[PDB]
Design a protein around this nucleic acid. Sequence first.
RNA 1: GUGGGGUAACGGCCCACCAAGCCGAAGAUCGGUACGGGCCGUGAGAGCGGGAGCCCGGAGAUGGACACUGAGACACGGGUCCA
RNA 2: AGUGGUGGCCACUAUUAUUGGGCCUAAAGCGGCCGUAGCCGGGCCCGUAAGUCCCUGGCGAAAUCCCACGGCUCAACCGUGGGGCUCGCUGGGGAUACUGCGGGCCUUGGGACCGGGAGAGGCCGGGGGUACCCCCGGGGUAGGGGUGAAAUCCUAUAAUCCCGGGGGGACCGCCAGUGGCGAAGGCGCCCGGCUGGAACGGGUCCGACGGUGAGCGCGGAAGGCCAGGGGAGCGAACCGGAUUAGAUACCCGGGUAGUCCUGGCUGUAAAGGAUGCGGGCUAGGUGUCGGGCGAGCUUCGAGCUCGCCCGGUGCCGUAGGGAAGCCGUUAAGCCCGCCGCCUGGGGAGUACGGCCGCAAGGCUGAAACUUAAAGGAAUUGGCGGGGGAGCACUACAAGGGGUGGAGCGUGCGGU
Lengths: 35, 61, 295, 129, 143, 155
Amino acid sequence: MKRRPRKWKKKGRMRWKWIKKRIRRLKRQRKKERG
Amino acid sequence: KPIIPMPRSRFLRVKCIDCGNEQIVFSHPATKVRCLICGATLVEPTGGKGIVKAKILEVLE
Amino acid sequence: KVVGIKGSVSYLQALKYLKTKKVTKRLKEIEKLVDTLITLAPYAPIETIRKNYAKISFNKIKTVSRSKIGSPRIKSIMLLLWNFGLLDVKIIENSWYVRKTKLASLLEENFKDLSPSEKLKVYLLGGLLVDTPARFVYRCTLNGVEDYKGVKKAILGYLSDQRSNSLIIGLSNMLESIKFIEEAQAYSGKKEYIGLVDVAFYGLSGLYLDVKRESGKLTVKPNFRELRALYEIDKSVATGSDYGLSISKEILENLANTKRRKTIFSEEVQELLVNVIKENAISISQDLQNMYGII
Amino acid sequence: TLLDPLANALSHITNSERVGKREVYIKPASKLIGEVLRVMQKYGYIGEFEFIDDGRAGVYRVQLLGRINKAGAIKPRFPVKVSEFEKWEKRFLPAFEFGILIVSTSQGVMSHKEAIEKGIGGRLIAYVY
Amino acid sequence: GKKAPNGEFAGRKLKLKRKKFRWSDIRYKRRVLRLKEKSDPLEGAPQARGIVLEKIAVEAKQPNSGMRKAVRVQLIKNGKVVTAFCPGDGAIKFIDEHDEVIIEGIGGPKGGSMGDIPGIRYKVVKVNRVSLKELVKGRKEKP
Amino acid sequence: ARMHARKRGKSGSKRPPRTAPPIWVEYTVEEIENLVVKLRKEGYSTAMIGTILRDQYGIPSVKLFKDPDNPNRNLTITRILEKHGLAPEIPEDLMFLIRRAVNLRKHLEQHPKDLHSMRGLQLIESKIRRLVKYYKRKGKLPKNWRYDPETAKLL
RNA sequence: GUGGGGUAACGGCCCACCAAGCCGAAGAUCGGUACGGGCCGUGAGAGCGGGAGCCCGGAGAUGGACACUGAGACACGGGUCCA
RNA sequence: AGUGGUGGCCACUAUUAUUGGGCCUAAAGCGGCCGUAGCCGGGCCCGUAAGUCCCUGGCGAAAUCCCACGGCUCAACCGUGGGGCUCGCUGGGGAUACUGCGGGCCUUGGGACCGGGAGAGGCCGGGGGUACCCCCGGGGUAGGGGUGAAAUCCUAUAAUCCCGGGGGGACCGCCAGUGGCGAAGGCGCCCGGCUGGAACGGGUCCGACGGUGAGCGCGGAAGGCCAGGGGAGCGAACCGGAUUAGAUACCCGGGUAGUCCUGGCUGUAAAGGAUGCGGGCUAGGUGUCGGGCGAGCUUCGAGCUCGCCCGGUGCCGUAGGGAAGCCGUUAAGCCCGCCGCCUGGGGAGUACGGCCGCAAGGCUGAAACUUAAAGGAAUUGGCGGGGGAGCACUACAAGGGGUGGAGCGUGCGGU
């Protein structure tokens, strides 16, 4: 995981922690489907 | 802060109390200055200048 | 399943440089690692294990750099040494228990003052000379095997040949490793898992073989020039079964085709290796029966 | 750690004269520093300059006349021949023939103007204007 | 600290650093790998000859309100299909179904969609080899 | 004292810019050699030898005396030890670090969980290795010579 | 490397033996891309970009392969074979 | 006699920064340290002359380019004459200032030693404190607990509560700070044992051994994981009580993993000073910490007061810098060294691939397409279930009158 602090400004966007959790969920399911 | 650094420490020409031994000693010793003959302590190495115990005769630069 | 060594797939390529005199840092690492492993494992002879075996502390194995070596690497080298019948290793809950075999402590003693490369080379050859799974793989190659399918069919036949009780356990492990890694080596290009057939092909790569990776496959090819020397050595000291695997006519004629190569080592080393196993064939063979065989 | 006495000296001079002191002491004294100090004083930028035997590396004492605007040592010792010299005057000086540069030619450290008629190349060492 | 390396014997690193960071540029990356010349439907062609398939219009971006006429063109050269804006007043009537047409990039920012209409990349110039501007002016006649 | 701590403290010391030895000294150049060899045969290193000479004998510096055996080299206590088969083959400065490293290594053997001392070791062996490399450049040490902890135990 | 072959000619170019060399982190190998240069475009210049148009050098006759004849060719308007 | 549209290239751009950019707040210093190659390196003498510089022989074709003259009206074009390149190559002579190479000399930088003094510097053993929980005995009836309210919940087989005994795990309050120490994370009960480091004073020792650091190695908060133990309190999940239109929450009552010990893995954070490290230069003021010094006080314990020097640690502040916020010797000012990173926004830290890990995850990392801004400091209003002050009848405090109940008038919503 590389990041960019500029995202953490909440103007119009979800809290970054939850987004970073959801993307992990998607990666998990995708790798599981492949293997 | 001077342009050139001078040494603050001096030397002392010292006559001993007991046996009358004449010696040259550093102003800031690190160990106990023992006379040649009687062996008694002369200067005590402290944090700063050593604590002379004999009698000074003359300072030297 | 039984051995899922992951993340060190290419760590065993370096043995091929032992075929020549090329010297690398990696080969030096292998040399010191194997020497340390052999030194650690004692030659004592479930209660026997963890009483006159040696638990291995992974984090306590360090190079001469005060730098550690990856756990999969230590696992791979230990598993290889076992595969060549040089170390008796046992797996329990989170502990590897090692012990020096009988071929070890003899190949160790007789060659105490060789080069590290010479020491390793004689170790592999001495393991190969006796009835070891490595010997079975070498016989498979002599039959023209260059794939996992060929060796699995060969061992299926041998186990079904009613004279497999001397090495049944080790060969069962071989078949197990082939299972559940066939996909990695045949059906998925990404392998990330080295089977026992793969580590078997390595080592042979350090004597007379070259290995090519093809979308998981471990395609094999020997060279007849080098194969001739140890083929002659084996027929000179025939302390090992054929396992009912004939030499192919093609490999036979191609061995006949080439000219004689150098005898790997010096002739003194050749005769020492010959006589050491000749005079102790029974003891090492029955130790191997104890190790891989049922009874 | 110290790396180059000369550039440090020239920065010392410039920074000391921005506030506008009178007597400046440079600690790391070397021969090349003196050969440098000859040149601009020959152009009247500085007053007297002299060497003081400290006992470790010597000190250089200079009086400042308040003449120099900027005096700096070009580091990467660019070797320059004669006929292309102008290409560097546009890089370090504010106007046509304003100020000088120092070159270490085969004949020693010396001003750039005097090198044009002497017809000598060499490596640029410093500049002042 | 000081921008580095400044050494007289530092040519290798001074060159390598600049070459590396020239990749951080985007236009140079766009040129040297020529991926403009791999993603292009027009294959670096300021013109192309296509066949029209159906006329469509799009809503202008807000606050601009209206109906922007255009057509869909499959390209005889290669076969890709793209939208094609039609300029002129009432020019959609002039452009008919199944027309040989000449199409060309619309000259927006970076070649993007021009002005207040999104998505589109190209505009029409000649219809059946006849310049559309005059036909907007009515000076000529479609064959 | 900034290679590791990077702290600019200056507990250093000052010497006068003296070229000639002081007039008030009475010992001749021959007596200082006798005194230093007497101290050294007792088993004193050149640093502590010098401290004693300046402390009780009151001599500012041997370096202020010019070598009778060489007109262009200042006399040094180390050179005097060399003049009479007393100079050490391993220079004192590195020998002290060797013994410190060995004893600390014993402490770490007895205390595996002290990582601060581990780092102290990690830096003082870098000091030893740096000076070994320097001496290899200068040649005072044999080219093949390489510190090894097991050999260091012997030393 | 030794000793030989064929070449107009030296050369592993080729052959028998002998030995383990050679290259690579300063970028080998592999892949992408591409005839090199005099030059040309732009720019105050440092520089960036390009190499078709005239001259020199390199190479090719649909892809491939091969001889003869000739001082000179594997030969655009000479020859032979596969597709 | 051109003129427009479009596409490719250079400039515009110092948006590729050698000349010549930034990285505290706008994209941009990796959490920290060590260290190889490489790069950059103290002063003086002697030698060499490779680089470096001046002179000179051979050589870089023609064509193009600059200029004078001449010919075609002139021009373009052509010739006569002079000049220029990538001219990178090569023969020889001359110089020794700097770099390089060799030899010698010298300590300021760095490293090394010694004396007292300071510090939550680390590891190991022993002792011990307070509080808390459980258990036993005595007393005590009639509740306790908790909230905005209650409820769940414990309790009469004696609860809460008080006293007297037993066990247990965790942690070591105030002193405590703008204090100290540590490379950073981080480090506090007392004693003892081992161990690292710094500062101060003395160069007393080596003689440039140095700085940086691609590759490399190391240890490194909480949480999670593997194996065994342990589990007083707290408490992810979960289970109930409540609240609400809706409660998966905030609130309350319980409660597993966790939190603790031993071995190992994971390599993570707004690991922030959002400031990579070494040297030198540049007004000052102002307190404490350590060491040293000079005085005075001193019941003579650095015990106490004032000045000075060194190191670290704040604030204010001259000039200076910056878009400003602000920084301003502990620099975000001026020079000298080296590595990393940054090149509109989003996609995206994603896809694919590689490497590591037991797993979760880690280290690397695009493109298509889309958009005119994103973004930063800062001024004026508006607003706050923000604060402070002042007021107040189209407001309330106390008091009085009265509508909405019935009908009617007056005009209105709606038919």
